[PDB]
């Protein structure tokens, strides 16, 4: 815009491009996510005004919403360094434990928030969250697919992760919940404990392959009503669980039952937000601050 000048290209998102800027008359310093379209929906841009309401710590604040010439424009508060980079940064000696848990606590304060408001992200991801200096993490790139929801991919040539997908959502449940997120959240925070992906499907039903070879095939004793979700096959090979000390070393104890509550196939078996903020592996958290290079 011409409010705004461009600073870098951060990144090509879900929906459109996202640019680093400076608003050119308060000289503030934002992240501008430019959104493509011929009818423009409604029940978005009332979505997109939860979204704008949200104030919590540890969500990216949506400081304003431009539609103009067939754009859409959400200038966000701007944040450093995202996950994905910080966590390819310390691939070699590791993220140490006390600041994963304290990621993980503000992640989960941040979800606890957005679902007691009635809110879903939808696809949690590495890239998505983001950090800075003082020692926070934020959620940002919130979904609404409740609104233009996902198609192939994005507008253009880009390969949407699977990785973090609930098993729900690979299976065709139309009205996922929370329980989706935790799931996300679940994956992340295997991911930041063994330094790799925890299930890095290159296709939707090796997504779902990858995920029984792990937890098992799921079944009716495990997940009622399973067998009879949208896009479950009576053919899907039966894989056995394996033993999850070996899904996450060395991970402790605390927090490897942390984590198969939020891994339960069975979203209303899987914990919430708000009660894994009370689990015992929280005991002794703290804020420390990361060692970031920008
Ligand atoms: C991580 C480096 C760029 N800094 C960013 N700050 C904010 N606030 C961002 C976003 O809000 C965002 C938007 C779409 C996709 C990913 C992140 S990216």
Known sequence: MENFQKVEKIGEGTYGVV???????????????????????????????LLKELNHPNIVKLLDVIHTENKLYLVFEFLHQDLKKFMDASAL?????????????QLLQGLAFCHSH????????????LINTEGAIKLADF?????????????????????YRAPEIL?????????????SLGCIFAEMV??????????????????????????????????????????????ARQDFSKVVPPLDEDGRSLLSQMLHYDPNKRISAKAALAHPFFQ???????????
Request: with cysteine; glycine share 6%; net charge positive.
């Open 19 to 49: 640019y680093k800027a400076r608003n050119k008359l308060t000289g503030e310093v934002v992240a501008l996510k430019k959104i493509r379209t011929e009818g423009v929906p409604s029940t978005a841009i009332r979505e997109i005004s």
């Open 118 to 129: 009635r809110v879903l992200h939808r696809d949690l991801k590495p890239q998505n969250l």
């Open 93 to 105: 000696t590791g993220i140490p434990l006390p600041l994963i848990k304290s990621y993980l606590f």
């Open 143 to 163: 979904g609404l697919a409740r609104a233009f929801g996902v198609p192939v991919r994005t507008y253009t040539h880009e390969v949407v992760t699977l990785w």
């Open 284 to 294: 002794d958290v703290t804020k420390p601050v990361p060692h970031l290079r920008l």
């Open 194 to 239: 063994t330094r790799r992906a925890l299930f890095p499907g290159d296709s939707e039903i090796d997504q779902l392959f990858r995920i029984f070879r792990t937890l098992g095939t799921p079944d009716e004793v495990v997940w009622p009503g399973v067998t009879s979700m949208p896009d479950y096959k009576p053919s899907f090979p039966k894989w």
């Open 171 to 183: 299976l065709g449940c139309k009205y996922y919940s929370t329980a989706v997120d935790i799931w």
